[PDB]
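Subject: design request, 616 residues
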């Protein structure tokens, strides 16, 4: 007696028994807007997607409430879902992020398979027997596609006689795959190639939402009629509708251990396949090696590197995000954090892996471990508009500018030992970069006469690098072992370059530049945000040519491209803090020790104490 399992927006539901007594059972319930479901029968698992919650979840078939969030991020319209009961993976399409991804059956090791040339991928079917997954994307040009469940050999099989190509489901007995259509109202049938395209229920009668099958019988949903239907597997004949008065049936599968034929796993329980991901494959070994998103795989294969090497950190108004720079996929942003109101500037310290960022409604500076409970505060007092921040990764101090108080200030990374280095009456400091070797700190500031200044790392030797033809200078990156210094200006709308001493100057490209501007350099490439702050460009600094790695991401505020772990340069401050008891600030001549407000430097030129304290 084939049990049918189907989503229903408000709940998941199991029905049929032997098609009698109308025992539709509410498997899970109290959902909000469920679309897709699937199961791994052996383990008694039921998965679904929820379009209002943008999450994918799972439960235990037994009498239990047990529900676990499985994906809860990066999803917009997950409308297709397929479990791999063999290789033990989870696949799912997302019709709006136009991605196709995979994970372990617990949401972990989440790899994006495909992401290019996808228009509204929906229905999805796995063939773990072979290494083939099938899905349908439809849009300006609809099509059914095949590829390996490993990301290989993406083949377009059926690309004609289709419009809104509908549910996918395969006959393992016959090595044929069926598909429907939500517009042209047919059911068809082919070989697992694009081959032998036969009609099973041609003619405009079927208006199926989701197809399944079990022993010669095609079942499906017609949301319109609020019904479930069924007919011969071989012709349209037999077309009765199973008992069905059902409130918006969506996705549906035959809930039967026979619809998942088990077999030999291309990796054993041995190996566990690789180090992170063993995905099935048509390729000779019949399994393939994978790392999570943005993570590259060693030349040996089978072993994934540790995390990404470079990394592009985003600051939106109300979240932070990182895009990796190790892989082609890019547009895999991923985010984190709570209580972020209005983020402005961002920077990072590869040594301890803390992200630092400014928020100018909260008026505070904070740090985190990326996707880590890193989150502590750092500064919260006497702040206005922290429009720019710089980590000094050698002396282990944190610099930040302020627009409201027109100051530059330094603290140790933990926000201790605060000390005002620069405080100008007219001009007001905006964007800031550091050179802990060579001992310089450069910064743009706006004002009645907008200039670009520089100084030693303690504010001492103020030199005005740029003075003329600058309206509102914005971003300000630094090319180190090339001694150039890139910046932007919102008013004039052109990205210029320069010699480290303010001489090699020249427009690089023209550009319409936002007032709040993200702008950073790393490895021949420059990254900035567009005028509408919904997209990020990658530009060759040596070659001048542009490109857009990610759009449709509003409220972009500030960017930082950075190595993870990797660090470069040094100076004597790295030696037990220069010998200074509090603040050690490097200069071209040589480091100078400093003190928090109220303290006093003793003739050591190394030590601070609070005056009128002791008598010694
Ligand atoms: C479930 O599938 C697995 C994987 O094929 C079966 O486990 C073993 O599979 C090998 C592969 O041919 C057989 O040689 C063994 O005989 C299988 N185990 C044994 C000793 O039964 C497993 O049999 C399948 N479960 C069933 C019974 O349906
Ligand atoms: C961050 O704060 C910690 C304590 O919360 C500081 O740790 C030591 O603090 C004493 C007291 O001034 C200093 O004499 C030590 O030099 C500090 N240790 C180190 C590692 O230098 C610390 O100074 C602050 N930031 C650092 C440097 O970790
Ligand atoms: C920005 O303008 C100031 C003031 O005009 C420049 O400072 C001096 O400018 C006068 C001419 O107006 C020169 O004779 C001096 O040589 C300048 N100062 C010195 C001694 O360097 C300042 O140079 C301008 N900023 C820059 C460097 O572009």
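Subject: RE: design request

Done. Sequence follows.
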């Amino acid at each position: 007696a084939p049990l049918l399992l189907y989503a229903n927006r408000r709940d998941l539901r199991l029905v049929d028994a032997t098609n009698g007594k109308e025992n539709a059972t509410i498997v899970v319930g109290g959902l909000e807007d469920a679309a897709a479901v699937d199961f791994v029968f052996s383990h008694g698992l039921i998965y679904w997607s929820d379009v209002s919650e943008e999450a994918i979840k799972r439960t235990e078939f037994n009498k239990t409430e047990s529900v676990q969030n499985v994906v809860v991020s990066g999803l917009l319209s997950p409308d297709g879902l397929a479990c791999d009961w063999l290789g033990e993976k989870l696949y799912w399409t997302d019709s709006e992020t136009n991605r196709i991804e995979v994970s372990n059956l617990d949401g972990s090791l989440r790899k994006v398979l495909f992401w290019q040339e996808l228009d509204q991928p929906r229905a999805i079917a796995l063939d773990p027997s072979s290494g083939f997954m099938y899905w349908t994307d439809w849009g300006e040009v609809p099509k059914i596609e095949r590829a390996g469940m490993d990301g290989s050999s993406r083949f377009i099989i059926i690309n004609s006689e289709i419009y809104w190509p509908n549910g996918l489901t395969l006959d393992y007995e016959e090595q044929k795959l069926y598909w429907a259509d939500a517009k042209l109202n047919f059911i068809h049938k082919s070989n697992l190639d694009g081959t032998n395209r036969q009609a099973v229920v041609k003619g405009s009668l079927p208006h199926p939402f989701a197809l399944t099958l079990f022993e010669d019988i095609l079942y499906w949903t017609d949301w319109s009629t609020h019904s479930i239907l069924a007919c011969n597997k071989y012709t349209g004949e037999g077309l009765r509708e199973i008992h069905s008065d059902i409130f918006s049936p969506m996705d549906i599968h035959a809930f039967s251990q026979q619809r998942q034929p088990n077999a030999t796993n291309p990796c054993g329980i041995d190996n566990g396949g690789c180090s992170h991901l063993c995905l099935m494959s048509p390729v000779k070994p019949f399994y393939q090696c994978a790392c999570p998103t943005g993570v590259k795989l060693l030349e040996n294969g089978k072993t994934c590197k540790d995390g990404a090497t470079e990394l592009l950190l985003l600051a939106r108004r109300t979240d932070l995000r990182r895009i990796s720079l190790d892989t082609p996929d890019f547009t895999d942003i991923v985010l984190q954090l709570e209580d972020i109101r209005h983020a402005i500037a961002i920077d990072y310290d590869p040594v301890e892996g803390y992200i630092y960022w400014t928020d100018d409604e909260v008026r505070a500076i904070r740090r985190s471990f990326i996707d880590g409970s890193g989150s502590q505060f750092v500064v919260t007092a006497q702040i206005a508009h922290p429009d720019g921040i710089a980590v000094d990764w050698v002396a282990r101090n944190l610099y930040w500018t302020d627009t409201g108080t027109d100051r530059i200030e330094v603290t140790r990374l933990n926000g201790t030992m605060r000390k005002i280095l620069i405080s100008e009456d007219l001009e007001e400091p905006r964007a800031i970069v550091l050179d802990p070797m060579v001992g310089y700190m450069y910064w743009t500031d706006w004002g009645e006469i907008p200039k670009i200044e520089r100084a030693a790392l303690d504010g001492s030797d103020r030199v005005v690098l740029v003075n003329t033809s600058l309206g509102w200078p914005n971003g300000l990156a630094l090319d180190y072992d090339e001694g150039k210094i890139y910046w932007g200006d919102a008013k004039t709308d052109k990205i210029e370059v320069m010699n480290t001493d303010g001489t090699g100057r020249r427009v690089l490209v023209e550009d319409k530049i936002p007032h709040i501007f993200g702008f950073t350099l790393l490895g021949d490439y420059v990254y900035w945000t567009d005028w509408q702050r919904r997209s990020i460009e990658r530009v060759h600094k040596r070659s001048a040519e542009r490109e857009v790695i990610i759009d449709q991401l509003p409220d972009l505020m500030g960017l930082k491209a950075t190595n993870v772990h990797r660090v470069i340069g040094s100076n004597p401050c790295a030696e037990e803090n220069g010998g200074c008891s509090h603040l050690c600030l490097y200069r071209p001549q040589g480091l100078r020790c400093a003190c928090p407000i109220g303290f006093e430097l003793i003739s050591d030129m190394k030590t601070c104490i609070v005056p009128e304290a002791f008598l010694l």
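The pocket of ligand 1 is lined by residues 262-264 (CB under 6 Å).
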